[PDB]
C-alpha cells in the first residue's frame, strides 16, 4: 500500500511514485547533448508516427532565453509547463538585476521547482527530464541535466532517453575536450543514427541546434546545408 502517494516512505526508504515517474522517461525516444570548447550541440531523434502530420510538429528543442537552449524527453505537456516556468524565471531575473541569468542559477531554480512536487499528496511528480546549455564569454560552454526527482549535475555529454545505455557507451569514445562544434555536429548525427533502432521504429526525423561563439552566444537551429551534409556523413560512416 506504499505505491500510491509521494508522502509515504517504503519500509526501506524509497518513494515509488518518483520511481514510476522515472519509468515514464525510461521508455521515451532518445536525445543527446555534447559540450565543446567553442560551444554546445543538441541532437534529438524525433519520431514520426504517421504520414499525416507536418514535419515540425512536436518539437523538443525550445528557447528559454536568448542564450539558453533546452532539450526534453518524456511527457511533452509537462515539458511545455516546465519551459514556461523557466522562461518566467529568466525574465524576472533580468527585470530585477539588469543582466542575463547564469545557467548555473537557472538550473538551480528549476530543480527546486521540480523537487517541490515530490513531497505532497495533493500533487504528483513531473514525468519528463531535460537538458540545458549555454555559452558565455565569462564561463564558456555549459551543460546540465535535471531529473524527475530534482537532481541537477554538470556534464560533458548526456544521453537522456531510452537508448541511454548504448548512447553513453558510444559517446565516451569521442575526445570532445579538443573538438569543435563543426566537428561535433557530425559526430552527434552519426551517434544518433547508430543508436537508432530501425525495426520497431521505421522512420525518424532529425533536428539539431547549437549555441556557441559562431552564433555570438545566441541559441539557434542548425542551418539546412550543414544538416544535409551531416546526414550524408553519418550514412557513409554507418555502412
Partner 1 sequence: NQYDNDVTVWSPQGRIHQIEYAMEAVKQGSATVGLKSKTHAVLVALKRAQSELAAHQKKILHVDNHIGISIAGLTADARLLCNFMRQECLDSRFVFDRPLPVSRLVSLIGSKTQIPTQRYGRRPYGVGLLIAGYDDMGPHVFQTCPSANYFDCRAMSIGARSQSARTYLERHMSEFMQCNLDELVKHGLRALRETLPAEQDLTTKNVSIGIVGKDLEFTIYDDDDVSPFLDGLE
Partner 2 sequence: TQNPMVTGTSVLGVKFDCGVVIAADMLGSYGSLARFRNISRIMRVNDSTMLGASGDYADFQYLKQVLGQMVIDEELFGDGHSYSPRAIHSWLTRAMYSRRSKMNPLWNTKVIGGYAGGESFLGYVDMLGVAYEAPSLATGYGAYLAQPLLREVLEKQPVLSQTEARELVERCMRVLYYRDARSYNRFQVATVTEKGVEIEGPLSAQTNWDIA
Does residue number 62 form part of the binding site for partner 2 (CB under 8 A)?
A: yes
- From 25-33, 56-64, 106-114, 119-127, span contacting partner 2 (CB under 8 A): 56-64
Sign of CA dihedral 149, 64, 60, 228: negative
Angle between helical axes of 181-195 and 164-171 (0-180°, round to 10): 140
Restricting to residues 200-219, name those near partner 2 by CB under 8 A.
none
Closer to partner 2 at the Cβ: 72 or 179? 72
| 8 vs 15: CA distance, rounded Å | 7
Span from 89-97, 149-157, 174-182, 222-230 in contact with partner 2 (CB under 8 A): 89-97
Residue holding cell 554546445? 40
Binding-residue pattern over the window 100 to 139 for partner 1, x denoting contact by CB under 8 A: ---------------------xxxx--x------------
Residue 81 binds which one of partner 1, partner 2, none, with CB within 5 to 8 A depending on kind?
partner 1
Nearer to partner 1, 4 or 238 (CB): 4
CA distance 214 to 90: 23
Task: Tell me how far, at minimum, the Cβ of 110 lies from partner 1, in Å.
Answer: 17
Which member of 11, 52, 54, 95 binds partner 2 (CB under 8 A)?
95
Q: Which stretch binds partner 1 (CB under 8 A): 50-58, 137-145, 175-183, 227-235?
A: 50-58
**Cell representation of residue 151:** 537532481
Q: Is 148:126 a contact under the CB 8 Å cutoff?
A: yes
Task: Report how far residue 1's alpha carbon sits from residue 234's, in angstroms, rounded to the nearest whole number.
Answer: 50
Find the binder of partner 2 among 7, 10, 57, 91 (CB under 8 A).
Answer: 91
Asked if 176 and 184 count as a contact pair (C-beta separation under 8 A), the reply is yes
Query: DSSP string covering 61-112, please?
Result: EEEEETTEEEEEEE-HHHHHHHHHHHHHHHHHHHHHHSSPPPHHHHHHHHHH
Bridge partners (DSSP) listed for residue 211: 40
Per-residue binder mask for partner 2 (CB under 8 A), 68-87, x = binder = -------------------x
CB of 129 to partner 1, least distance (A): 12
The sheet carrying 140-146 orders its strands as 61-65, 68-74, 128-136, 140-146, 152-154
> Rule CB under 8 A: which residues touch partner 1?
3-4, 17, 20-27, 50-54, 56-58, 75-78, 80-81, 84, 121-124, 127
> Rule CB under 8 A: which residues touch partner 2?
62-66, 87, 91, 94-95
Amino acid at each position: 500500500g506504499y505505491d500510491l502517494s509521494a508522502s509515504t516512505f517504503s519500509p526501506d526508504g524509497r518513494v515509488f511514485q518518483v520511481e514510476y515517474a522515472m519509468k515514464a522517461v525510461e521508455n521515451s525516444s532518445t536525445a543527446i547533448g555534447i559540450r565543446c570548447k567553442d560551444g554546445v550541440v543538441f541532437g534529438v531523434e524525433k519520431l514520426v508516427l504517421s504520414k499525416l502530420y507536418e514535419e515540425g510538429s512536436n518539437k523538443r528543442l525550445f528557447n528559454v532565453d536568448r542564450h539558453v537552449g533546452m532539450a526534453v524527453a518524456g511527457l511533452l505537456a509537462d515539458a511545455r509547463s516546465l519551459a514556461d516556468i523557466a522562461r518566467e524565471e529568466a525574465s524576472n531575473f533580468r527585470s530585477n538585476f539588469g543582466y542575463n541569468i547564469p545557467l548555473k542559477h537557472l538550473a538551480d531554480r528549476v530543480a527546486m521547482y521540480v523537487h517541490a512536487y515530490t513531497l505532497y499528496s495533493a500533487v504528483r511528480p513531473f514525468g519528463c527530464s531535460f537538458m540545458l546549455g549555454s555559452y558565455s564569454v565569462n564561463d564558456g560552454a555549459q551543460l546540465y541535466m535535471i531529473d524527475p526527482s530534482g537532481v541537477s549535475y554538470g556534464y560533458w555529454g548526456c544521453a537522456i532517453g531510452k537508448a541511454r545505455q548504448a548512447a553513453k557507451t558510444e559517446i565516451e569514445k569521442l575526445q570532445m575536450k579538443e573538438m569543435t562544434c563543426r566537428d561535433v555536429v557530425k559526430e552527434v548525427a552519426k551517434i544518433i543514427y547508430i543508436v537508432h533502432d530501425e525495426v520497431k521504429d521505421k522512420a525518424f526525423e532529425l533536428e539539431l541546434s547549437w549555441v556557441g561563439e559562431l552564433t555570438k552566444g545566441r541559441h539557434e537551429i542548425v542551418p539546412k546545408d550543414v544538416r544535409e551534409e551531416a546526414e550524408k556523413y553519418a550514412k557513409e560512416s554507418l555502412k
